[PDB]
Amino acid sequence: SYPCDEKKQNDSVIAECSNRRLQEVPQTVGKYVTELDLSDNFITHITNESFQGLQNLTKINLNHNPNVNGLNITDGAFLNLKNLRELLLEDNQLPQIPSGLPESLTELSLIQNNIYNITKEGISRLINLKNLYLAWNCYFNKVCEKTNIEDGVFETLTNLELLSLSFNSLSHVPPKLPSSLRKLFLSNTQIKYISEEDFKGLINLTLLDLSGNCPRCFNAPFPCVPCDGGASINIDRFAFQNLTQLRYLNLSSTSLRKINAAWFKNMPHLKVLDLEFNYLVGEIASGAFLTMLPRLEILDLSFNYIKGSYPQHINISRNFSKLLSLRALHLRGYVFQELREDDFQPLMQLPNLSTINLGINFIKQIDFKLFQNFSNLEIIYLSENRISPLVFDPHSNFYHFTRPLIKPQCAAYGKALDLSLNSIFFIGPNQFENLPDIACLNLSANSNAQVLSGTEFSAIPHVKYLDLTNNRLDFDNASALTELSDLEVLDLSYNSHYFRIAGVTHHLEFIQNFTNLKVLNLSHNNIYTLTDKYNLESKSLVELVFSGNRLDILWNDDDNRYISIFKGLKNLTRLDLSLNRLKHIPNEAFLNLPASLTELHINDNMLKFFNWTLLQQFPRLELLDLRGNKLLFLTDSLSDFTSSLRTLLLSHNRISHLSLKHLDLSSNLLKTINKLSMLELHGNPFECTCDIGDFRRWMDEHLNVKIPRLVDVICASPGDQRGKSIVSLE
Amino acid sequence: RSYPCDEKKQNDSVIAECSNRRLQEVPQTVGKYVTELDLSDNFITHITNESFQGLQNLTKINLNHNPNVNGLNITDGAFLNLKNLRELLLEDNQLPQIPSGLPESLTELSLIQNNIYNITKEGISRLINLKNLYLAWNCYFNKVCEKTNIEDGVFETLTNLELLSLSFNSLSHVPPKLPSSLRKLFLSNTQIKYISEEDFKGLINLTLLDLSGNCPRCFNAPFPCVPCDGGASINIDRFAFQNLTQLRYLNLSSTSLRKINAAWFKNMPHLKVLDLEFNYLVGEIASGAFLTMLPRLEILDLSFNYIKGSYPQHINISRNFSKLLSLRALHLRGYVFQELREDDFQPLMQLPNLSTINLGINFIKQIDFKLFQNFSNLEIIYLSENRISPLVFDPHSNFYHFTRPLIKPQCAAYGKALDLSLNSIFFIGPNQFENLPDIACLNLSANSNAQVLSGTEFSAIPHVKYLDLTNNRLDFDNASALTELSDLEVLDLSYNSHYFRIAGVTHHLEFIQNFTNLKVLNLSHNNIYTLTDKYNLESKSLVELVFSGNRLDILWNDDDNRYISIFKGLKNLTRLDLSLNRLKHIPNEAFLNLPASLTELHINDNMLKFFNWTLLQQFPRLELLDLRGNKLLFLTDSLSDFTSSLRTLLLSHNRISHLPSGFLSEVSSLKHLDLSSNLLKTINKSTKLSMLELHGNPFECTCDIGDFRRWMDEHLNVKIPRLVDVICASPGDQRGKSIVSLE
Ligand SMILES: *[C@@H]1O[C@H](CO)[C@@H](O[C@@H]2O[C@H](CO)[C@@H](O[C@@H]3O[C@H](CO[C@H]4O[C@H](CO)[C@@H](O)[C@H](O)[C@@H]4O)[C@@H](O)[C@H](O[C@H]4O[C@H](CO)[C@@H](O)[C@H](O)[C@@H]4O)[C@@H]3O)[C@H](O)[C@H]2NC(C)=O)[C@H](O)[C@H]1NC(C)=O
Ligand SMILES: *[C@@H]1O[C@H](CO)[C@@H](O[C@@H]2O[C@H](CO)[C@@H](O[C@@H]3O[C@H](CO[C@H]4O[C@H](CO)[C@@H](O)[C@H](O)[C@@H]4O)[C@@H](O)[C@H](O[C@H]4O[C@H](CO)[C@@H](O)[C@H](O)[C@@H]4O)[C@@H]3O)[C@H](O)[C@H]2NC(C)=O)[C@H](O)[C@H]1NC(C)=O
Ligand SMILES: *[C@@H]1O[C@H](CO)[C@@H](O[C@@H]2O[C@H](CO)[C@@H](O[C@@H]3O[C@H](CO)[C@@H](O)[C@H](O[C@H]4O[C@H](CO)[C@@H](O)[C@H](O)[C@@H]4O)[C@@H]3O)[C@H](O)[C@H]2NC(C)=O)[C@H](O)[C@H]1NC(C)=O
Ligand SMILES: *[C@@H]1O[C@H](CO)[C@@H](O[C@@H]2O[C@H](CO)[C@@H](O[C@@H]3O[C@H](CO)[C@@H](O)[C@H](O[C@H]4O[C@H](CO)[C@@H](O)[C@H](O)[C@@H]4O)[C@@H]3O)[C@H](O)[C@H]2NC(C)=O)[C@H](O)[C@H]1NC(C)=O
Ligand SMILES: *[C@@H]1O[C@H](CO)[C@@H](O[C@@H]2O[C@H](CO)[C@@H](O)[C@H](O)[C@H]2NC(C)=O)[C@H](O)[C@H]1NC(C)=O
Ligand SMILES: *[C@@H]1O[C@H](CO)[C@@H](O[C@@H]2O[C@H](CO)[C@@H](O)[C@H](O)[C@H]2NC(C)=O)[C@H](O)[C@H]1NC(C)=O
Ligand SMILES: CSc1nnc(CCCO)n1-c1cc(C)c(C)c(C)c1
Ligand SMILES: CSc1nnc(CCCO)n1-c1cc(C)c(C)c(C)c1
Ligand SMILES: *[C@@H]1O[C@H](CO)[C@@H](O)[C@H](O)[C@H]1NC(C)=O
Ligand SMILES: *[C@@H]1O[C@H](CO)[C@@H](O)[C@H](O)[C@H]1NC(C)=O
Ligand SMILES: *[C@@H]1O[C@H](CO)[C@@H](O)[C@H](O)[C@H]1NC(C)=O
Ligand SMILES: *[C@@H]1O[C@H](CO)[C@@H](O)[C@H](O)[C@H]1NC(C)=O
Ligand SMILES: *[C@@H]1O[C@H](CO)[C@@H](O)[C@H](O)[C@H]1NC(C)=O
Ligand SMILES: *[C@@H]1O[C@H](CO)[C@@H](O)[C@H](O)[C@H]1NC(C)=O
Ligand SMILES: *[C@@H]1O[C@H](CO)[C@@H](O)[C@H](O)[C@H]1NC(C)=O
Ligand SMILES: *[C@@H]1O[C@H](CO)[C@@H](O)[C@H](O)[C@H]1NC(C)=O
């Protein structure tokens, strides 16, 4: 299956031809293929011969061609393809919409080109278009002052559901838009005024994006140019009167000081409202508009701080109690010093509020008991505040940061409190007094140097997932954290002494006291020696991450004190030993790794030899990861030593000569192959020669097996073929 | 030409540096003129009386850290031959006993980091000339030495002994029968929990006593630590120090002290330096009888005396601090408190010579900054690692008192220095610097500070000369940025990025030209890839631009050639750092538009495949050219035709495989040529050259090299370092031998 890999999905067969240095549309493409991904290549010309005799094609991706003049597409180059629905032509340095596109198309993407004329003929006549993407064409870099949209070019597209013109200079919403529209994206379009007539038709509209017009252009990485003065976007009172279906409204970075409550009079289903990066401190305090949003589930009022203002208190309108459907409130970057019980009274009566996001407010103190008064809080996000011890890609939501606030696997356990990146340099006795019952707690990165003694967390004893990463904690005391008898996940990654000094010693006895600890992460603790007790012991532990410590020192111990260090983890199935500067694992030591192991990582060490013999000791082992070592040869008789192994990763080793499903030998020193569904081989210095004919034939006799990056499976020698993919030659 | 050691003249005397050379024996190829021999950090296993035969003149030997990667075997009387041996260093040698038969000539002996548990007469008594004896670290916590045994009176015979260090051994009690000659006695970490009146006896000449780390304050300690019973402090008799009238330096750090007996200092009128770090003296700081007893104290360290879990509103400073009349530096780190008021520091305001106040690591939320106006000689206000908001191992180091300058000397040289690094100044409040004295040196490093600089932020301290803004998230796009500091000479904006760590950051560097006396600017690691509106840096004054870790590759592959002249407007620039800019190729005309004034050009750690040597003609003043760590393949045949000014050319870690014949030829304005770590197999046939570095090349040790070998012997002036690492790659049997080794 070449030159592309060809694969089943659904009832459709797919050709992945992305990122392979192709200089032309191959003619070696499977005839069954209905979707062709040619993205991120070096293709320069598309003609009506490029896709000849291929009626079946339904989707083509030509994005990012070519790399490192743009893409030349003849007139009617695609017209032949009677079934073409989806055509992606992003980042192609196109100067005009290609002429003679097939009427079959339902999705067309021309983002990141140089198209300044949206002409009928170009797109008129593509009546079947549902989704049309024209964003990022007349962006500030280079020639287009304004994007010329021929009058009524879209009125003919009466099935158009999505139109994106974001990141082009338009000045005004185009007239003569089809009523069929459901999602209209007009972010960053230099539209400083919205008339009553601009959206009058669009009854079916569920999403409107006007973000970044009259931007709040403060320290924004991307070019930012506000309207004259600090002037906000101008939106007519009745601009939105006929948009009864709107669910998503984005007004981020429109320099808004006032929000007209009449905008929402006829908008009873509004679900999500983005008001990040405006100046709505006043409006938050009064807030007529808040009574008009009884179905709002998500409100983002982030980064509406006033420059230079660090008020004692936040002023929350009482009208917030009228957001009855509110599930998530995002109030980052208001910036204020104190949160009192009373300031959040309006929110205490909202029945479905499960997320309060107060990140990046530099709050010095919070009256923490106030969070007891919420019936459905699942997420309290307080990262980047100042709590003390208590005694690019177009398809990104630029204005709203998009990944989960708290790691899903932590918040899964229950109520989550994230106090990362605050001032909690030690754990005060009253640190967690008056909190609700917390299951997930983040203390990451507080320069916290607490000597854990078994009393610090007793006020929230039902924590299940505890992130303590990037602190300077001492867990020598065997009672450390034992007050959390229900703890399942503990992350102590990157924990070191305060002074970041050479030395330190560890005592890991506290581990055994937990009867339900599942995952423990000790990565990059620079553990080189254990005190008094040389064995980790746990009946419950399933995953130990030990990367970035000094097992080289521990196992070269003159007394062999640590030969059985992990053996006491009787239930362990995953072990990470990466980055331990291992040259040689004493045979004995390796045999005393838990027999229960399922996944063993010893990558990025300096292993010169591996005793393959010992694998019989691990009947359950499925994955063995030995990447990035210095290994020289493989055993001839692997089948003797394991029946279990599915995946063996050997990339970045020195192997020069040659029951399971995946073998990675990429980036080794193989000159040839003499004589299971994935074999990785790229990066080996193949001697492209006839000896190689054996292996070549083997490839043809096993098409099911996947070999990725064939294009990077390269002849090194002799000189005649060097740099040539082994497959092309005969 | 010396081998294996490098030999040099130091003062009057000749010296051999044979450190870290993988030697497996004491060489016999050592210069006869040599009086000091450094064989440290090698693979030597045996020292016999033959090791140093024919080196009578040796005065100092360093055998430290032999061997590397069981210990060093020294025969009896191995050194006895050497009549002039004064200084013998035997550190980290895994020795089990003091070598027997040491020469009586010794004045300094160091046996630190070994396994010596018996300090015997026979070992050292009768080395009557010893002045300095170091026996620290022999019976530490790790391994066998349960306790360390000192034969009675072993030191009484050493009547010239001035320094005795027994730190980091288990002793339990100060040894008896110590010579009166002692001036410095180090007993740190010796498990000595009690000090009697009799312990210091007749040590009337003593100027330094170190008792730190006995009954340690163990909390969170970086190194293994064992406190005494309960939280008990060291026990020091009232009269323990009554006859130590000369004492100048007393170290009581980490002795768990709650109370300081003022009678300890009754007879100690000259005490200069007093270390009390890591104790529990919060109470004593508030009352502090002892403070009246120290009129000549210049340095007081009361750091890290915080109480566990205590974060009091206020610090309580005794009025008795006003009796420390000679005080030059006060170190009060890690007391930990929330607020500093004017009144709290009244006692210190009247001390005439107090020039350093060190309040690092106190997590102070607010300070009444006007209070520092009331000090006549403050040169250093050190406030790192506090919580100010916006206003609207090596045994020869001090183990307890962190030793480098608090503030970079080159910053503090300009004047009063204020260090507010690692605080909470996420923006610059309008009142940030209201009420400060006149500050010349200011550190704002690492405050997550996202200020949009507009030319007003620093107007209350307008005479700042050295400004460190590193590791913040500042915007200096406004051309008025920092212009209120018209006297600014040094600006460090290293590691400045957007708050949200989102990339794509654009820059405007017009503000630079406003300063008529800006000398050094550091824009390193700002990931600058594009400039808005103005594409030229311009300055009449600037001498040094550090531009490392930006994207000149992007800037110079500009399709419009917008940045061909980017630096040309820096008319006075003499040093430019272009390292780490991912440069593959510098457009010829971009290189020509680098300032002609340049004296030092660094383009190292890029990916240069080619270098247009011809352009060096445009730089008649260029003295240093640094092209290390690139991908360069060959050298022009006649460098002399392109420069008559170049002294130093660094080409380490490049792909050069052939030396042009007639190169290194003609004009020789070249003193230093570094071709180490390249791909040279040999050097053919073909100067004021005085250093040639060649180590790390895969030399082909077959007979053709003989040319180069002979050339070495015929040019002894030319220094070639690391000859031991100038190594045959081929043919096998020669591989791994130094080429000088070949017959
Ligand atoms: C300290 O050490 C701990 C434990 O190792 C680290 O925590 C783990 O981090 C890993 C990422 O390293 C997490 O694994 C990732 O979880 C994602 C979510 O998984 C969902 O779907 C799976 C399907 O099986 C479910 O099992 C699961 O319940 C979730 O609903 C996955 O998206 C990731 O998938 C990965 O594998 C596939 C290949 O099969 C790839 O296609 C993906 O791209 C990706 O590589 C991944 O599995 C794991 O969840 C974490 N565990 C815990 C307890 O949090 C910490 O990160 C570490 N700390 C630090 C600072 O390093
Ligand atoms: C942003 O950019 C600036 C400018 O580069 C950096 O500040 C400079 O940092 C360098 C070191 O990285 C400083 O250079 C060092 O100065 C030391 C002090 O020198 C004293 O003694 C000499 C005696 O000749 C005098 O010339 C000098 O005036 C001082 O009295 C030197 O000790 C260093 O010497 C180096 O060279 C010799 C080789 O001959 C070696 O033996 C030394 O060990 C060492 O390698 C060195 O010259 C420079 O002084 C700083 N300048 C300023 C203005 O501050 C900032 O570091 C940078 N910021 C960041 C975050 O990188
Ligand atoms: C203004 O706010 C609105 C919300 O009110 C916001 O609209 C959202 O835009 C984002 C980004 O363009 C859309 O997210 C995409 O959804 C599509 C369709 O299902 C997917 O193709 C995308 O996922 C792919 O690509 C991702 C990243 O490139 C990958 O991570 C992913 O695996 C997929 O391969 C992506 O999720 C989102 O649909 C809309 N919201 C809607 C339609 O309701 C708008 O972007 C805001 N404006 C700005 C400038 O931020
Ligand atoms: C308790 O406090 C006392 C001071 O009251 C302190 O004594 C000091 O010890 C340090 C460390 O040994 C000494 O500083 C050294 O002085 C000597 C001689 O002049 C030098 O050899 C040392 O420099 C060498 O090493 C340095 C780095 O290791 C290098 O910079 C240099 O190149 C040299 O190779 C170093 O400057 C100091 O002499 C004494 N103070 C005296 C004698 O007054 C003692 O260390 C404290 N105790 C503990 C446990 O910390
Ligand atoms: C606790 O807080 C830290 C900081 O917010 C989180 O660390 C980030 O993790 C994400 C997602 O895995 C990474 O992509 C980022 O690089 C990390 N950010 C920083 C600032 O280090 C961490 O995930 C949080 N822990 C939990 C369980 O939610
Ligand atoms: C400003 O404060 C920062 C942090 O205190 C100083 O940064 C240290 O610089 C020294 C010497 O160059 C290094 O050895 C340390 O590793 C640095 N620490 C950190 C956390 O970066 C900086 O030197 C100070 N600036 C001045 C001018 O004194
Ligand atoms: C907090 S009120 C404020 N006033 N000036 C600033 C920065 C300068 C103008 O952009 N900030 C501020 C605001 C925000 C949102 C963050 C993240 C930071 C670091 C600082
Ligand atoms: C100062 S109050 C305090 N109470 N317990 C601690 C840590 C436990 C001591 O081993 N700290 C504290 C003290 C210091 C000195 C620093 C630096 C930190 C981060 C915290
Ligand atoms: C609006 O959407 C509905 C589906 O609810 C559809 O039937 C109608 O035709 C759409 N309006 C158009 C295409 O103008
Ligand atoms: C709260 O959530 C439930 C389930 O998602 C839903 O039925 C209910 O209507 C929501 N409450 C409001 C006021 O919307
Ligand atoms: C092993 O861990 C699993 C979870 O992965 C758990 O259900 C079980 O309790 C553990 N088994 C034993 C024998 O401890
Ligand atoms: C692997 O180690 C075992 C010791 O348990 C030994 O018997 C065997 O010889 C080793 N195999 C190899 C190839 O070194
Ligand atoms: C004590 O010190 C002085 C030098 O400061 C000296 O004159 C006297 O002899 C010394 N005592 C000895 C060597 O016993
Ligand atoms: C202050 O310093 C000067 C010069 O360094 C010195 O002469 C003077 O004695 C010192 N003052 C006191 C009170 O010791
Ligand atoms: C440039 O700086 C140098 C110091 O390198 C100095 O000698 C010269 O006077 C300065 N010239 C100007 C014009 O500032
Ligand atoms: C270097 O550039 C100059 C242009 O000034 C040109 O004359 C010369 O040929 C170039 N040399 C090389 C080796 O490219």
mmCIF file of C-alpha atoms in Angstrom, chain A residues 372-455:
data_model
loop_
_atom_site.group_PDB
_atom_site.id
_atom_site.type_symbol
_atom_site.label_atom_id
_atom_site.label_comp_id
_atom_site.label_asym_id
_atom_site.label_seq_id
_atom_site.Cartn_x
_atom_site.Cartn_y
_atom_site.Cartn_z
ATOM 1 C CA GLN A 372 -19.292 25.511 51.810
ATOM 2 C CA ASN A 373 -22.428 27.420 50.782
ATOM 3 C CA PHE A 374 -22.516 25.917 47.266
ATOM 4 C CA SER A 375 -24.590 22.813 46.601
ATOM 5 C CA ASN A 376 -22.954 21.680 43.321
ATOM 6 C CA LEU A 377 -19.371 23.028 43.223
ATOM 7 C CA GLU A 378 -17.091 20.506 41.568
ATOM 8 C CA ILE A 379 -14.245 22.883 40.623
ATOM 9 C CA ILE A 380 -12.664 25.727 42.604
ATOM 10 C CA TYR A 381 -9.844 27.067 40.431
ATOM 11 C CA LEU A 382 -7.539 29.417 42.346
ATOM 12 C CA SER A 383 -4.235 29.065 40.492
ATOM 13 C CA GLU A 384 -1.980 32.140 40.216
ATOM 14 C CA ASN A 385 -3.222 33.973 43.261
ATOM 15 C CA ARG A 386 -1.295 35.003 46.392
ATOM 16 C CA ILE A 387 -2.649 32.796 49.157
ATOM 17 C CA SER A 388 -0.158 32.687 52.048
ATOM 18 C CA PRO A 389 0.288 30.182 54.827
ATOM 19 C CA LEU A 390 -2.711 30.406 57.119
ATOM 20 C CA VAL A 391 -2.172 30.907 60.789
ATOM 21 C CA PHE A 392 -0.652 30.448 15.264
ATOM 22 C CA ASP A 393 -3.143 27.612 14.655
ATOM 23 C CA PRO A 394 -6.284 29.172 13.212
ATOM 24 C CA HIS A 395 -8.616 26.633 14.727
ATOM 25 C CA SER A 396 -7.937 27.670 18.317
ATOM 26 C CA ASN A 397 -10.098 29.609 20.742
ATOM 27 C CA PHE A 398 -7.584 32.472 21.004
ATOM 28 C CA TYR A 399 -9.565 34.408 23.577
ATOM 29 C CA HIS A 400 -10.657 31.476 25.701
ATOM 30 C CA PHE A 401 -7.983 29.015 26.839
ATOM 31 C CA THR A 402 -9.435 25.631 26.043
ATOM 32 C CA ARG A 403 -8.045 22.543 27.902
ATOM 33 C CA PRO A 404 -9.586 21.395 31.194
ATOM 34 C CA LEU A 405 -8.742 23.694 34.094
ATOM 35 C CA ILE A 406 -7.944 20.722 36.258
ATOM 36 C CA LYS A 407 -6.593 17.424 35.102
ATOM 37 C CA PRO A 408 -9.595 15.212 34.333
ATOM 38 C CA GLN A 409 -8.100 12.282 36.147
ATOM 39 C CA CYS A 410 -7.941 14.390 39.333
ATOM 40 C CA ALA A 411 -11.354 16.030 39.085
ATOM 41 C CA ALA A 412 -12.939 12.605 38.374
ATOM 42 C CA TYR A 413 -12.552 11.807 42.073
ATOM 43 C CA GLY A 414 -14.691 14.679 43.244
ATOM 44 C CA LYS A 415 -14.547 18.297 44.389
ATOM 45 C CA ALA A 416 -11.335 19.821 43.115
ATOM 46 C CA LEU A 417 -9.399 22.703 44.581
ATOM 47 C CA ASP A 418 -6.452 24.112 42.638
ATOM 48 C CA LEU A 419 -4.121 26.267 44.713
ATOM 49 C CA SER A 420 -1.126 25.937 42.416
ATOM 50 C CA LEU A 421 1.189 28.887 41.900
ATOM 51 C CA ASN A 422 0.331 30.730 45.086
ATOM 52 C CA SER A 423 2.453 31.792 48.103
ATOM 53 C CA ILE A 424 2.004 28.750 50.289
ATOM 54 C CA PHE A 425 5.617 28.433 51.295
ATOM 55 C CA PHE A 426 4.584 26.277 54.222
ATOM 56 C CA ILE A 427 1.297 24.591 55.202
ATOM 57 C CA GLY A 428 -0.265 26.673 57.960
ATOM 58 C CA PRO A 429 -2.276 24.901 60.647
ATOM 59 C CA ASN A 430 -5.475 26.580 59.375
ATOM 60 C CA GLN A 431 -4.682 26.046 55.687
ATOM 61 C CA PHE A 432 -7.680 23.827 54.994
ATOM 62 C CA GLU A 433 -9.975 24.778 57.872
ATOM 63 C CA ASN A 434 -13.515 25.541 56.565
ATOM 64 C CA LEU A 435 -13.069 23.879 53.175
ATOM 65 C CA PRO A 436 -15.729 21.555 51.865
ATOM 66 C CA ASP A 437 -14.819 17.913 51.404
ATOM 67 C CA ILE A 438 -12.076 18.014 48.779
ATOM 68 C CA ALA A 439 -11.176 14.968 46.649
ATOM 69 C CA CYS A 440 -8.715 16.613 44.254
ATOM 70 C CA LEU A 441 -6.098 19.100 45.420
ATOM 71 C CA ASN A 442 -3.361 20.917 43.511
ATOM 72 C CA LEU A 443 -0.562 22.502 45.489
ATOM 73 C CA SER A 444 1.860 22.542 42.597
ATOM 74 C CA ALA A 445 4.565 25.198 42.612
ATOM 75 C CA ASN A 446 4.243 26.993 45.922
ATOM 76 C CA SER A 447 7.904 26.766 47.005
ATOM 77 C CA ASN A 448 6.465 24.793 49.852
ATOM 78 C CA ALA A 449 9.041 23.423 52.245
ATOM 79 C CA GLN A 450 6.770 21.720 54.752
ATOM 80 C CA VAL A 451 8.164 18.825 56.765
ATOM 81 C CA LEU A 452 5.220 16.474 56.314
ATOM 82 C CA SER A 453 4.288 14.899 59.629
ATOM 83 C CA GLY A 454 0.820 13.369 59.193
ATOM 84 C CA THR A 455 -1.278 16.282 60.451
#
